[PDB]
Amino acid sequence: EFARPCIPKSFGYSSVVCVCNATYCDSFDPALGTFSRYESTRSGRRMELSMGPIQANHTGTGLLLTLQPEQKFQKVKGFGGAMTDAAALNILALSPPAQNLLLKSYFSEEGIGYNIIRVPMASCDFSIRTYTYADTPDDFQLHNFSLPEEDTKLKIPLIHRALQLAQRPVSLLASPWTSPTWLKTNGAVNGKGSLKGQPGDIYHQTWARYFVKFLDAYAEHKLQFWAVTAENEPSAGLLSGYPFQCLGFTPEHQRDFIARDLGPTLANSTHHNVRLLMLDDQRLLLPHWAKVVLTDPEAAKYVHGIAVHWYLDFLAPAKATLGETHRLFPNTMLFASEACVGSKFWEQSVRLGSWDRGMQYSHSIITNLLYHVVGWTDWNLALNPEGGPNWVRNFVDSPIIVDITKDTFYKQPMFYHLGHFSKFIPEGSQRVGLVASQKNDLDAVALMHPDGSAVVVVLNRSSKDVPLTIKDPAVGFLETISPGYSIHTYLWHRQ
Ligand SMILES: *[C@@H]1O[C@H](CO)[C@@H](O[C@@H]2O[C@H](CO)[C@@H](O[C@@H]3O[C@H](CO)[C@@H](O)[C@H](O)[C@@H]3O)[C@H](O)[C@H]2NC(C)=O)[C@H](O[C@@H]2O[C@@H](C)[C@@H](O)[C@@H](O)[C@@H]2O)[C@H]1NC(C)=O
Ligand SMILES: CCCCN1C[C@H](O)[C@@H](O)[C@H](O)[C@H]1CO
């Protein structure tokens, strides 16, 4: 519609947030052989558009990044975030006009064109109430399964509004944290405990049927799922005292649950097209978890992909984990399903305007893309200034922070860093080769849109400006510069 600049505000951190309210939010409005550049900087530029010429020749010894359009890697599924109870409550705390600008920021082409929404199956830490959908004890046939108001009045109507705003088809992803407690060895939503008994038994068939019941219930409200994960962070339920909703699975337990219960139960339902993602956990668990599950032909036939979380990335070099998994199982897509900053005990939950947190998002996304990952999903879409609500006070940060007392929301550097990918990398884009002429400190990734046009994202996490050239053998050269602490997305038609 109308380009509207960022209203910047400092809270004493490395960069600014962009301030939006009931009546204002920043928003957005290429001939060959010109390119488009979108730039965001620590100094305060927010996805600003500029253009350049593509030259026929280049001479120099500076950094050159050469597109290898014939070297084809993964297709992109997409980008988005999570509609938790906390996110829904924060969004709905705004006046309806401000709610609409927040939703448009994320889901509109006038915003950043999210096409993924992760939906918890009942309560997680980012809930104010602890509940499942089948809390009546020993209800093995699930006669009393139902969605409560957290879904029917809060999450579902918000998801519908997001879908209405989006011009791209939106894919929903569901993940459970805990089963009903009466299905669990420890009889509690949290702590160390798994499903009682063994895969193939009444407890496991009931838990498998719960997934179908969830999907049935959402489909009654006219929402269809792209995928479900087999459990959020199954490793969590293996840990003594784990503080909030979880459900423990070893990789063998998960393998046999998928083979015997979950896979066949979904396959025999009207939801047989919904994809099943395994793991949904820290990538250090790869490739071991992939080997355990995927080398059993009975489990493998049901698994579409492997979902990863980013929290222990420091213990898990991408080559040894993502790269090795891809090498062994290249037909089982890798998908980043949850990330947030501010979650470590020593970290401040919310740092309004943190450029570092921004760069953390984009560095992870680029690294993921360079190691075959097909999409990347943020955690809570919005939180309050404390990084909540959260029933166990496990507060964290969010690209959007809602200030209820001011009917205001703040878009953080994380929002724009994610936007440098989500806005410009449609579903069906394919990552292609990009080689550097010399060692450098930049993170860079090249992809091709479904129509054959090019997209390159370049992140400079250093304080030093790096002039550089991008070579496309089809079109020519783009002479540019990557300022210290910047992120650029470059777009051009190749035909
Ligand atoms: C919602 O957010 C928008 C953008 O921040 C607010 O509109 C803007 O309000 C500013 C007032 O703080 C306007 O600026 C002033 O300009 C004069 C010169 O013409 C200066 O002398 C002065 O120092 C200010 O800088 C600003 O122009 C305005 N609009 C835009 C599009 O930038 C909005 O504030 C509300 O609306 C405006 C138009 C005024 O009526 C304000 O009094 C009013 O608070 C924010 N909404 C709310 C309710 O906070
Ligand atoms: C190892 C750190 C995991 C971080 N958590 C993952 C879990 O899925 C979410 O429910 C949490 O909110 C998140 C942050 O503590």
Side-chain angles (χ1 to χ4, degrees), residues 314-337:
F314 80 102
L315 293 161
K319 184 186 198 207
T321 53
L322 303 181
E324 185 61 17
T325 302
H326 182 257
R327 189 181 71 75
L328 293 164
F329 305 98
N331 296 314
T332 311
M333 60 83 117
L334 289 166
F335 180 85
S337 59

Side-chain angles (χ1 to χ4, degrees), residues 7 21 23-24:
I7 302 298
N21 54 26
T23 68
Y24 189 100

Side-chain angles (χ1 to χ4, degrees), residues 4 7 19-25 406 408:
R4 287 181 193 79
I7 302 298
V19 187
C20 300
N21 54 26
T23 68
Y24 189 100
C25 201
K406 297 179 188 182
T408 292

Side-chain angles (χ1 to χ4, degrees), residues 125-126 177 232-233 244 282 309 311 338 343 379 394 396:
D125 57 325
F126 278 96
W177 271 238
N232 180 69
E233 304 193 339
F244 57 87
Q282 315 319 316
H309 295 193
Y311 298 102
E338 200 196 295
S343 83
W379 189 206
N394 181 222
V396 307

Side-chain angles (χ1 to χ4, degrees), residues 2-31 33-208 210-221 223-297 299-305:
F2 288 94
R4 287 181 193 79
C6 174
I7 302 298
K9 187 181 177 130
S10 181
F11 288 90
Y13 303 105
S14 57
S15 192
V16 296
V17 297
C18 302
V19 187
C20 300
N21 54 26
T23 68
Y24 189 100
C25 201
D26 56 291
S27 60
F28 296 95
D29 277 329
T34 69
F35 64 88
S36 296
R37 182 206 286 101
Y38 284 92
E39 165 176 74
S40 297
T41 66
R42 194 175 70 169
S43 67
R45 295 183 194 276
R46 292 288 176 272
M47 301 186 74
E48 300 189 351
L49 177 63
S50 58
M51 314 201 145
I54 292 172
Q55 353 283 359
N57 321 110
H58 163 256
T59 325
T61 59
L63 174 56
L64 180 78
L65 300 182
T66 302
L67 198 84
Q68 309 195 301
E70 80 290 357
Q71 295 297 310
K72 306 286 199 191
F73 303 95
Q74 78 277 21
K75 302 253 179 83
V76 168
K77 177 59 206 183
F79 299 93
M83 189 64 77
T84 52
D85 292 346
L89 289 163
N90 282 298
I91 300 167
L92 290 162
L94 294 163
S95 80
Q99 293 177 13
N100 290 334
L101 300 166
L102 183 163
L103 294 176
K104 286 176 198 177
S105 289
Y106 273 137
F107 295 104
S108 186
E109 295 304 321
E110 316 176 347
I112 67 174
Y114 273 13
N115 73 315
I116 297 180
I117 306 170
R118 188 168 178 234
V119 184
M121 294 167 56
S123 68
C124 64
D125 57 325
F126 278 96
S127 292
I128 65 183
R129 189 167 80 85
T130 79
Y131 60 92
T132 77
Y133 298 139
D135 288 326
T136 298
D138 304 342
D139 178 22
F140 292 97
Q141 289 318 286
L142 300 175
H143 289 338
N144 305 307
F145 182 102
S146 63
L147 308 182
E149 290 188 6
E150 283 87 352
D151 302 84
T152 61
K153 305 212 148 187
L154 303 204
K155 293 156 57 177
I156 280 163
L158 283 173
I159 293 166
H160 279 295
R161 293 164 65 190
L163 293 182
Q164 279 293 312
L165 292 167
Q167 284 172 222
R168 302 179 205 187
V170 175
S171 286
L172 318 178
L173 173 60
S175 306
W177 271 238
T178 184
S179 67
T181 62
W182 51 269
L183 291 171
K184 294 183 65 175
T185 60
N186 64 321
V189 294
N190 57 6
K192 179 177 185 168
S194 68
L195 290 168
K196 288 169 160 178
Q198 66 186 262
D201 78 5
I202 192 174
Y203 302 106
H204 294 73
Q205 312 259 46
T206 294
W207 183 232
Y210 182 111
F211 278 75
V212 169
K213 278 244 147 190
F214 171 74
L215 295 163
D216 282 344
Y218 262 64
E220 291 161 29
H221 295 257
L223 296 169
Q224 186 182 12
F225 279 80
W226 157 67
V228 302
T229 72
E231 169 58 26
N232 180 69
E233 304 193 339
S235 73
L238 315 175
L239 186 58
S240 148
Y242 194 80
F244 57 87
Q245 299 91 324
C246 57
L247 182 66
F249 297 82
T250 66
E252 292 82 20
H253 190 167
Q254 172 156 116
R255 175 199 63 207
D256 296 336
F257 174 57
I258 286 172
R260 292 180 196 171
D261 303 296
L262 190 53
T265 298
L266 287 168
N268 190 44
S269 78
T270 64
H271 312 291
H272 57 90
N273 293 317
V274 169
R275 309 301 201 165
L276 173 62
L277 310 183
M278 66 163 280
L279 188 63
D280 200 18
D281 212 332
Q282 315 319 316
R283 71 169 189 228
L284 65 88
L285 294 165
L286 296 174
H288 178 70
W289 267 62
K291 290 174 175 176
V292 175
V293 179
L294 302 172
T295 61
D296 175 349
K301 63 173 150 191
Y302 300 113
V303 180
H304 170 74

